[PDB]
Design a protein around this nucleic acid. Structure first.
Length: 1240
RNA sequence: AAUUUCUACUCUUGUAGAUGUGAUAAGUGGAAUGCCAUG
DNA sequence: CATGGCATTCCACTTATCACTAAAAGATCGGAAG
DNA sequence: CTTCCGATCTTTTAGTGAT
């Protein structure tokens, strides 16, 4: 028997807290006199400007090392293909093994242990390889091994700035250490060139050979384009797509060349571009040949390879030089404008335009690749003047039309022919547009230019002027000025001259675009160091004179004290713990052993002395220093810790591979005895009690023992320290003291502290001191950021502040990582069938809506979350989005929307968890991958809502409640754990702890009462013939004289061409055209039954506005127009098909589509509602207007109800799932079968 | 109109809710501009 | 009035690793012994 | 006085986890 409160203290989580530091007294002065702010800023400046120097060494050794790699890829390809053939598990582990094998073989070159190379170069590579991740870089020791990077003296002087400070790069050391590891990390060289680029190359090989065997004609094309691109000149175009050629393509340059081969070199602007492989293949597919139909039947795009890590860009395509400063761009543009003006380009341009009215118009030609732009700009469609010329050339005449379009679309056409086919209205539109363009250009030239562009309006005016400029250029480039056909010599000469005169605006335009779109600089914080190499790396009392960080607690307040190096050295400053009665500070005492698995072998078995001693002789060795008693080390123990093999005999890999569990158990028992002896005899840990441990042979796994052991090591005490001593240490300058501070520690606050502040209070709670649930962690940094009743707006940026970041770990007593968490959740839900369900849906009126249901599907509660603390957030969302797109072409700042995002989502989250703890339910969300929405719904931007899952996940990872008692479940010391750690959206299945994921569609459109939804697709019916075929596909239709409603009876296996193809649970349907009489709700307001809302599409191609409809009244008006008698209950179906005019058929189709339109909404009038045309088995026409709380209130409420029902189905299957597993989503047919089944 | 930071309010010189930092790397998507084609 | 494939720049986003460290080991430096 | 030696300060390091 497990209970809901049992889901706590399951696994550790790690959080970071941020605080502002207030200096206390003279320490603010004394930090300035040492000037550590400027020194640290200079240090950090040296760091980021020296970082690109360092990785050049990494790049150089990577390129040198990889060029010797030579491997067969046949086995890896075979494994990949075999796993592709069928996705059984043992092939997956086979492919995993092959991937690890290839990764290790590639890493062998890096370590210098590869077999294929000789021993001298192997030892050379090893001698290099040990030097990358040490201080050998900074003194240039490894530079002697390379002699290739060849830094200048300024770089060497930069390297001299970090003498005796190499620990600053430890994080960078680890970051680059992830690179050269065969450990399947996504950010690693061998994982990239094994699992990322190589499958792409293999499939590119296979699609190439399929293209070759499909048609051999493009083999000539491919060799031709290789010769044109001039890349890989020493190999065949077949051989490059062969597996042995992947012995190249490891360095960046070959990757770049391959990508250029796929894409093609881009020349400078205004020039023809050399096409690539994908481009020529797309040109082949765009010819609409039967061969293209053969190609369209095949995959038809190569895939570029991923970029090699740490390298740079070395493309052959043209790179435009970028601008530097505002004054540069404005002076360049001012002088360009004055040059253009003094060149009098406008006057000769005007002379060029009016010349057209007094020239032989057939003697001037227009480029065939620009005429469609002119047709679009001067008519309602691009195809207007194209079809005009097409039908003119047709009119002056099967294959003849082909020759006409061939001669038309490719050849440049004289202007007189254009005028003859077009008409003088296009001439007047042309002269109007040219007048507008010349007016814009003249105004832009007359308009001066601002003194900078940091304001948006300056960017606007320059963008407008330069925009008019390249618009004029686009106007100028319309004319086919080439002399292949006739062209007027003086006119062409003046046109070419003026185009060359005003040419470089386009380059000016792109350079201005690149300069203005740069993100503006803002001031940043940087890490403080106080000349401490290891400032606050850890808190331990032994290291506290080296890490230099000491905490104090004073009557509720918190103080962090830093002592610096005095006269360039660590003066041993210490204090005396006085009585608790004495006034003063309470110093924290950090007694901590980091981890048994790393420290015990370090201080015990992997010392230099023991390794030397036991290499010489087999005699056991006694260790004395840092031990109260001489510690025995046996040969056997060293053999277990140093097995000359990957699996240690006490560790579980030995058990998994070997299988001899006896030796595994005995080695484990011996190891536990040894580490118990070590913990007994070691100086730091001899004072700790370990009586809570089980005896040695009872333990199951070593990791279990370690996870048991680690919480015993960590321990905090507190000692009162006299106040005047601390004051004297501060006044001497020997102690820098800050107060840890946030909003909540201010005196003017009352009630509801911030959650992080509540964590901080809970860390130092005496109960947490008794047993450690909240553990303070190491590696804390300090940041300095410079500067940037009536209250001052933006007060917190006015002056410089000292920031403080500190990591803490929650649920310390729990295990390191969760295991079988979903299994535990499924077990609890199996034991509790009575658990409620909460459904979430994204509405159109509401941003989000919630529904609470039981196991019986009864609505406990629905509620609007559209407004929280009486605010409409969708309004601000749409204003911010419209300013985003308005600033997009405006060359403005990009900005962010995500603060308003998470501000609304936080209140949503808080309401969600309040409901969750109140109801002890589960929560169902829609799968983000299996759906699509747009602006018709409120919040539904896919990027917006997908991110909303994330804070839900980690808030449910370590959920606490601010008003709970700290010792209670849901308090600080017992956080609720309900989910697992989020990794990636594509990673988790349908279940994440108590959360559940279901397919989005077929949720809102269904009637809740019986499970009816329209099965008919309506884009099928385009003509009255299809509409007639649709209306004949019906069973029986008659009018109820008693109820005054029109009754349609429908069966499956009819209109299957118009169905959506998903069968329902029952084959019978009885649609009722409800009479549009008045009806009343639960409250008493009248409403019209069957009322529908419909957009306007009367113009047959566009969408209008919304309007009302009364289908029964319009229906009876239609039959009175047709004069067909229907007050008899007779079959109206033969009577309707008698009148075969397309208008009548279209009207009845529209009416029955409208009554099949389940969703009814118009926010302009404010009516969002659901009316079911299909009546109940009780005969009740369902409406959401009835306001029954038993049924959903609104349409989005209906969707939330239905997604809750989907979750109910999924967990009911879990109840039937005896394997404790879950389905891979929910099939739509299964869903509608289920909902129709229990509804009917 | 305040905040470690962010959001919403403003009486409270504050309120309520959220808030894993740092470093590194890669990828994706937009937009603009050119080039070649197609409807 | 758009689409397809490319190329350059700029911006935005996600995604995917590592650390959450006391002590050994080694460098080095200032003051007494030969 | 230089060499050495013991103090002292950076720098690297140690490695678990399912029938």
């Amino acid at each position: 028997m497990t209970q809901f409160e049992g889901f706590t203290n399951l696994y550790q989580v790690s959080k970071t807290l941020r605080f502002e530091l207030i200096p206390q007294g003279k320490t603010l002065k004394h930090i300035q006199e040492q000037g550590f702010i400027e020194e640290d800023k200079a240090r950090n400046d040296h760091y980021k400007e020296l970082k690109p120097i360092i990785d050049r060494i990494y790049k150089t050794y990577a390129d040198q090392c990889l060029q010797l790699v030579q491997l067969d890829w046949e086995n890896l390809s075979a494994a990949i293909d075999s796993y592709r053939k069928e996705k059984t598990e043992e092939t997956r582990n086979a492919l995993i093994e092959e991937q690890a094998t290839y990764r290790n073989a590639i890493h062998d070159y890096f370590i210098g242990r590869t077999d294929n190379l000789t021993d001298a170069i192997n030892k050379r590579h090893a001698e290099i390889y040990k030097g990358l991740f040490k201080a050998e870089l900074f003194n240039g020791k490894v530079l002697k091994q390379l002699g290739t990077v060849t830094t200048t003296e300024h770089e060497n002087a930069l390297l001299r700035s970090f003498d005796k400070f190499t620990t600053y790069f430890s994080g960078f050391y680890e970051n680059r250490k992830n690179v050269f590891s065969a450990e399947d990390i996504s950010t690693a060289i061998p994982h990239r060139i094994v699992q990322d680029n190589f499958p792409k190359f293999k499939e590119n090989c296979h699609i190439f050979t399929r293209l070759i065997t499909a048609v051999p004609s493009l083999r000539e094309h491919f060799e031709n384009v290789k010769k044109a691109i001039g890349i890989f000149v020493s190999t065949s175009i077949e051989e490059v797509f062969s597996f042995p050629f992947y012995n190249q393509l490891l360095t960046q340059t070959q990757i770049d060349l391959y990508n250029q081969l796929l894409g093609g070199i881009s020349r400078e602007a205004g020039t023809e571009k050399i096409k690539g492989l994908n481009e020529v293949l797309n040109l082949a597919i765009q010819k609409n040949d039967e061969t293209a139909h053969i190609i369209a039947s095949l995959p038809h795009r190569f895939i570029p390879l991923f970029k090699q890590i740490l390298s740079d860009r070395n493309t052959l395509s043209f790179i435009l030089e970028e601008f530097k400063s505002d004054e540069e761009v404005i002076q360049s543009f001012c002088k360009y404008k004055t040059l253009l003006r003094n060149e009098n380009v406008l006057e000769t341009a005007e002379a060029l335009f009016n010349e057209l009215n007094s020239i032989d118009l057939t003697h001037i030609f227009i480029s065939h690749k620009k005429l469609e732009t002119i047709s679009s700009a001067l008519c309602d469609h691009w195809d207007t003047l194209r079809n005009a010329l097409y039908e003119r050339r047709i009119s002056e005449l099967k294959s003849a039309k082909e020759k006409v379009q061939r001669s038309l679309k490719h050849e440049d056409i004289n202007l007189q022919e254009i005028i003859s086919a077009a008409g003088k209205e296009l001439s007047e539109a042309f002269k109007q547009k040219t007048s507008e363009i010349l007016s814009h250009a003249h105004a832009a030239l007359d308009q001066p230019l601002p003194t900078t562009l940091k304001k948006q309006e300056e960017k606007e005016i320059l963008k407008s002027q330069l925009d008019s400029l390249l618009g004029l250029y686009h106007l100028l480039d319309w004319f086919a000025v080439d002399e292949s056909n006739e062209v007027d010599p003086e006119f062409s000469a003046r046109l070419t001259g003026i185009k060359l005169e005003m040419e470089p605006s386009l380059s000016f335009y792109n350079k201005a675009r690149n300069y203005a779109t740069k993100k503006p600089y803002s001031v940043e914080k940087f890490k403080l160091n106080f000349q401490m190499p290891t400032l606050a790396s850890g808190w331990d009392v032994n290291k506290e004179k080296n890490n230099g960080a000491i905490l104090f607690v004073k009557n509720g307040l918190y103080y962090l004290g830093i002592m610096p190096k005095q006269k360039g050295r660590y003066k041993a400053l210490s204090f005396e713990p006085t009585e608790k009665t004495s006034e003063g500070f309470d110093k924290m005492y950090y007694d901590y052993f980091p981890d048994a698995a790393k420290m015990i072998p370090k201080c015990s078995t992997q010392l230099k002395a023991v390794t030397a001693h036991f290499q010489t002789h087999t005699t056991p060795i006694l260790l004395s220093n840092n031990f109260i008693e001489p510690l025995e080390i046996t040969k056997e123990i060293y053999d277990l810790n140093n097995p000359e093999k990957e699996p240690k005999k006490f560790q579980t890999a030995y058990a998994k591979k070997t299988g001899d569990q006896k030796g595994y158990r005995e080695a484990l028992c011996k190891w536990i005895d040894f580490t118990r002896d070590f913990l007994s005899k070691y100086t730091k840990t001899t004072s700790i009690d370990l009586s809570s441990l089980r005896p040695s042979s009872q333990y199951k796994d070593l990791g279990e023992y370690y996870a048991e052991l680690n919480p015993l090591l960590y321990h905090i005490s507190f000692q009162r320290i006299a106040e005047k001593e601390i004051m004297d240490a501060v006044e001497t300058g020997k102690l820098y003291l800050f107060q840890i501070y946030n909003k909540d520690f201010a005196k003017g606050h009352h009630g509801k502290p911030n959650l992080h502040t509540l964590y901080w209070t809970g860390l130092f709670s005496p109960e947490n001191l008794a047993k450690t649930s909240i553990k303070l962690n190491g590696q804390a940094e300090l940041f300095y950021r410079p500067k940037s009743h009536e209250i001052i707006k933006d007060r917190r940026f006015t002056s410089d502040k000292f920031f403080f970041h500190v990591p803490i770990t929650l649920n310390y007593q729990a295990a390191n990582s969760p295991s079988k968490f979903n299994q535990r959740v499924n077990a609890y839900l199996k034991e509790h069938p009575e658990t409620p369900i909460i459904g979430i849906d994204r509405g159109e009126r509401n941003l989000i809506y919630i529904t609470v249901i039981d196991s019986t599907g009864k609505i406990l509660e629905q509620r609007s979350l559209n407004t929280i603390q009486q605010f409409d957030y969708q309004k601000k969302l749409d204003n911010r989005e419209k300013e985003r797109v308005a600033a997009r072409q405006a060359w403005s700042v990009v900005g962010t929307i995500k603060d308003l995002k998470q501000g609304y989502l936080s209140q949503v989250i808080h309401e969600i968890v309040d409901l969750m703890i109140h109801y002890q339910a589960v929560v169902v969300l829609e799968n983000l991958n299996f759906g699509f929405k747009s602006k018709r719904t409120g919040i539904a931007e896919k990027a917006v809502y997908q991110q909303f899952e994330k804070m839900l996940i980690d808030k449910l990872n370590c959920l606490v409640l601010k008003d709970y008692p700290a010792e209670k479940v849901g308090g600080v010391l017992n956080p609720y754990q309900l989910t697992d750690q989020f990794t990636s959206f594509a990673k988790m299945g349908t279940q994440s702890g108590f959360l559940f994921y279901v397919p989005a569609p077929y949720t809102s459109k269904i009637d809740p009462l019986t499970g009816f939804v329209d099965p008919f697709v309506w884009k099928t019916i385009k003509n009255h013939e299809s509409r007639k075929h649709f209306l004949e596909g019906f069973d029986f239709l008659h009018y109820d004289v008693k109820t005054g409603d029109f009754i349609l009876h429908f069966k499956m296996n009819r209109n299957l061409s118009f169905q959506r193809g998903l069968p329902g649970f029952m084959p019978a349907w009885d649609i009722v055209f409800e009479k549009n009489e008045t009806q009343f709700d639960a409250k008493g307001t009248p409403f019209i039954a069957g009322k529908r809302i419909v957009p306007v599409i009367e113009n047959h191609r566009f969408t209008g506005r919304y309007r009302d409809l009364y289908p029964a009244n319009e229906l009876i008006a239609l039959l009175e127009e047709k004069g067909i008698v229907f007050r008899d209950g007779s079959n109206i179906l033969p009577k309707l098909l008698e009148n075969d005019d397309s208008h009548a058929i279209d009207t009845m189709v529209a009416l029955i589509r409208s009554v099949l339109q389940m969703r009814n909404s118009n926010a302009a009038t404010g009516e969002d509602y659901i009316n079911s045309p299909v009546r109940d088995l009780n005969g009740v026409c369902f409406d959401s207007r009835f306001q029954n709380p038993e049924w959903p209130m609104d349409a989005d409420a209906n969707g939330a109800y239905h997604i809750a029902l989907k979750g109910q189905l999924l967990l009911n299957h879990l109840k039937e799932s005896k394997d404790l597993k879950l389905q891979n989503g929910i099939s739509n047919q299964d869903w509608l079968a289920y909902i129709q089944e229990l509804r009917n």
